[PDB]
Design a protein around this ligand. Sequence first.
Ligand SMILES: *[C@@H]1O[C@H](CO)[C@@H](O[C@@H]2O[C@H](CO)[C@@H](O[C@@H]3O[C@H](CO[C@H]4O[C@H](CO)[C@@H](O)[C@H](O)[C@@H]4O)[C@@H](O)[C@H](O[C@H]4O[C@H](CO)[C@@H](O[C@@H]5O[C@H](CO)[C@H](O[C@@H]6O[C@H](CO)[C@@H](O)[C@H](O)[C@H]6NC(C)=O)[C@H](O)[C@H]5O)[C@H](O)[C@@H]4O)[C@@H]3O)[C@H](O)[C@H]2NC(C)=O)[C@H](O)[C@H]1NC(C)=O
Ligand SMILES: *[C@@H]1O[C@H](CO)[C@@H](O[C@@H]2O[C@H](CO)[C@@H](O[C@@H]3O[C@H](CO)[C@@H](O)[C@H](O)[C@@H]3O)[C@H](O)[C@H]2NC(C)=O)[C@H](O)[C@H]1NC(C)=O
Ligand SMILES: *[C@@H]1O[C@H](CO)[C@@H](O)[C@H](O)[C@H]1NC(C)=O
Ligand SMILES: [Ca+2]
Ligand SMILES: [Ca+2]
Ligand SMILES: [Ca+2]
Ligand SMILES: [Ca+2]
Ligand SMILES: [Ca+2]
Ligand SMILES: [Ca+2]
Ligand code: NA
Ligand code: NA
Ligand code: NA
Lengths: 291, 276
Amino acid sequence: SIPIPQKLFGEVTSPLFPKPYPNNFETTTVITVPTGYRVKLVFQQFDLEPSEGCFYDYVKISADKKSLGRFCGQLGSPLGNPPGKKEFMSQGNKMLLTFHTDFSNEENGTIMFYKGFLAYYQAVDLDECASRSKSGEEDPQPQCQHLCHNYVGGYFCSCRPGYELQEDTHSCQAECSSELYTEASGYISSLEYPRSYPPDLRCNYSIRVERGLTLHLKFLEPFDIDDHQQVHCPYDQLQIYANGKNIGEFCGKQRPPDLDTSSNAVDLLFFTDESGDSRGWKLRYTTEIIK
Amino acid sequence: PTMYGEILSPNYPQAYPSEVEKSWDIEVPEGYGIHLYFTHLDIELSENCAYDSVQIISGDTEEGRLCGQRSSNNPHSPIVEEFQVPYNKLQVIFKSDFSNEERFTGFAAYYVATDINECTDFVDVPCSHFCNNFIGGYFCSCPPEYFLHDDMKNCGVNCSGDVFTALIGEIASPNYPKPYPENSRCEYQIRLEKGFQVVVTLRREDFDVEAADSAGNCLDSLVFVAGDRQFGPYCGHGFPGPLNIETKSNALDIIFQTDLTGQKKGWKLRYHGDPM
Ligand SMILES: *[C@@H]1O[C@H](CO)[C@@H](O[C@@H]2O[C@H](CO)[C@@H](O[C@@H]3O[C@H](CO[C@H]4O[C@H](CO)[C@@H](O)[C@H](O)[C@@H]4O)[C@@H](O)[C@H](O[C@H]4O[C@H](CO)[C@@H](O[C@@H]5O[C@H](CO)[C@H](O[C@@H]6O[C@H](CO)[C@@H](O)[C@H](O)[C@H]6NC(C)=O)[C@H](O)[C@H]5O)[C@H](O)[C@@H]4O)[C@@H]3O)[C@H](O)[C@H]2NC(C)=O)[C@H](O)[C@H]1NC(C)=O
Ligand SMILES: *[C@@H]1O[C@H](CO)[C@@H](O[C@@H]2O[C@H](CO)[C@@H](O[C@@H]3O[C@H](CO)[C@@H](O)[C@H](O)[C@@H]3O)[C@H](O)[C@H]2NC(C)=O)[C@H](O)[C@H]1NC(C)=O
Ligand SMILES: *[C@@H]1O[C@H](CO)[C@@H](O)[C@H](O)[C@H]1NC(C)=O
Ligand SMILES: [Ca+2]
Ligand SMILES: [Ca+2]
Ligand SMILES: [Ca+2]
Ligand SMILES: [Ca+2]
Ligand SMILES: [Ca+2]
Ligand SMILES: [Ca+2]
Ligand code: NA
Ligand code: NA
Ligand code: NA
């Protein structure tokens, strides 16, 4: 009785309800909630013509592409197949209902009066995240790489620490531009270490300590960057600026030597190629004092 | 005033400034609860979260106080700590002292508005008989041949004039659970098929009628007539008869007599059918 696209809940009654329903009648009413919503519904009253297997009269409720129920009879009699109060949720936003009644509702040569039913339906929000169709989403991209969020109606996504969400709001890039370090000691590592580092990066790991200190840089094992023995660092480069000037462009398999800067300001620039096979690098930076 | 939101520490995901106290006031529309969960937690560790802390206060009460370094253990979920509240407003107060021993990236959290299922989510149910929840509110419903009071909360039945045909149904005294009206004679009629039997159930505690005199005669009385058989008259505080009664009859007449004064809470009952 309330099929409309923009409607939260609603009531669906048998014809002429509460007055008993007429014979030779079959009507299909389809509930439609807006996009991104499931359809819940229950029955308060239920009084139909009973039949073993529901041959005479029935209510046929079907989901998106599957017939969920076909039930008939009265609320309490063991005559067979009453829903009573049971919940019937759909998957999509559409729920197809049908009410069928043949020519004879007067069993056993006497008159009988059957009211009908009272169906209530509410809308629900669906958890887009929990669907989890990891493979087979090429026409849409309804699932995100790091994390999604389930809220009413729609859904939005977000990235791991240190990553930015690009325009599609479905995938993430790395920010890795203003990575600042002002603490006394500290650890600096390539993003997702010791896993393969992302490609096509321009990282500026800036260390700026309080004036009057000298920096000590200690590289950790492993130290894996795509290198080449003919010309060093063709694909990936790890440049190091100290006190405004470059002090070495590193890449390879064995870790660079422990460095003493005599500076309070260093900048580690990280340039990547368009592939990640090597693992990365990690370093501890400490501070010492002067007179 | 949103259905969702993000809360990050200042200068995330870098180190946070010292000597700070930032507050956020979360607000969702009427009839929504709030689910506030933390995707990242890295704060200066102190006993009872003394030095640095993030504080969750709902209205006037402190819903939480968190600190320390913690990351998500489950690879299938990014959540580290979380809270669920039935309120439509929140306050979050993050405070940090003048010093940090190490570099602490702060925290990253998000909130989403959730519907309150007023029927189940609350201890007090604001409906006399039946409750209907919907996204953003609720409304009540009533059994067969019950009429809603203008308060839109409690249901009522008419004292006389209705014909019951349902196999299973409910009947109550007028204004229930409010006191019953005085000087009334209420006759209700239940009519099933000849082959069926009316079996009546009513709870012992849902019965409070003016007590009888010293001689044991009910001043106000309730009485069940099933053709020739008869159960009653019943009166007093508490139903004296059994809770499950089989009448062995398809037609039943319930009669309720009251005088001018000496009223009480009243009664409520519910009947179903059993074949013959
Ligand atoms: C990776 O990240 C690092 C982060 O440090 C980048 O290093 C920076 O490189 C760029 C150059 O590539 C450069 O930054 C700029 O610096 C100029 C000043 O440079 C002048 O120096 C030459 C020397 O001959 C002069 O000839 C020119 O006149 C140059 O202009 C700024 O004007 C730039 O614009 C803004 O910078 C800040 C932000 O508002 C403002 O303040 C200036 O910043 C500089 C530092 O850059 C000064 O430093 C301050 O000095 C006080 C002295 O009391 C000290 O407390 C402390 O050292 C500094 N304090 C503060 C609060 O900055 C002054 O502050 C002032 O001149 C500007 O007014 C303007 O709004 C731009 O900052 C610089 O060499 C470094 N460092 C910084 C911080 O920028 C690196 O470039 C990145 N990698 C890549 C590839 O880009
Ligand atoms: C209790 O049961 C019925 C409930 O159906 C009571 O009837 C009350 O009065 C009339 C009956 O015709 C109905 O509402 C009235 O309808 C007229 C139709 O023109 C309309 O103008 C008014 O708005 C008026 O409300 C309705 O059935 C019901 N109304 C109310 C407010 O209770 C009946 O009085 C009781 N007893 C019996 C034995 O039914
Ligand atoms: C229906 O059932 C009753 C009881 O079994 C029986 O007496 C009656 O004859 C039946 N109706 C018809 C039309 O036979
Ligand atoms: Ca029929
Ligand atoms: Ca959703
Ligand atoms: Ca590479
Ligand atoms: Ca601090
Ligand atoms: Ca609600
Ligand atoms: Ca009385
Ligand atoms: Na790495
Ligand atoms: Na921060
Ligand atoms: Na009462």
